[PDB]
Design a protein around this ligand. Structure first.
Ligand SMILES: [Au+3]
Ligand SMILES: [Au+3]
Ligand SMILES: [Au+3]
Ligand SMILES: [Au+3]
Ligand SMILES: [Au+3]
Ligand SMILES: [Au+3]
Ligand SMILES: [Au+3]
Length: 129
């Protein structure tokens, strides 16, 4: 599924991601924009053989099981495929765990480099919320 910008804002809010760990909704929408372009089926292979999955490009090294990332963990207790679903519940639930892990949204490289400190409210501007 390819989400529209306000459509994803609304889905994220329904699943309680707005202001989760103090991160406003625009930060989550921005991160999803530059991680996946709002496509739930986005995947990206890393040089280390791990893979990033879904709207927020969650990595198999630590958070999900894909069977092909030696030495890896599955801290969200889900198959990585679940992160590619049209319904974002598994990705939101896993994102809450990630963002609680200590470095906040800096775990998302694309957030740090393209969203952090920018006018992230722009991503929810005009949205009926
Ligand atoms: Au905002
Ligand atoms: Au992999
Ligand atoms: Au794993
Ligand atoms: Au397996
Ligand atoms: Au594995
Ligand atoms: Au599994
Ligand atoms: Au923080």
């Amino acid at each position: 599924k390819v989400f529209g910008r306000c459509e994803l804002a609304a889905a994220m809010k329904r699943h309680g991601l707005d202001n989760y760990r103090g991160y406003s909704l625009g930060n989550w929408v921005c991160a999803a924009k530059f991680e996946s372009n709002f496509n739930t089926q986005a995947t990206n292979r890393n040089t280390d053989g791990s893979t990033d999955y879904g709207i927020l490009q969650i990595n198999s090294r630590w958070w999900c099981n894909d069977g092909r990332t030696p030495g890896s963990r599955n801290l969200c207790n889900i198959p990585c495929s679940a992160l590619l679903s049209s319904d974002i519940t598994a990705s939101v639930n896993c994102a809450k765990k990630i963002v609680s892990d200590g470095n906040g949204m800096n775990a998302w490289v694309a957030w740090r480099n393209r969203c952090k400190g920018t006018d992230v409210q722009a991503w929810i501007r005009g949205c009926r919320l």
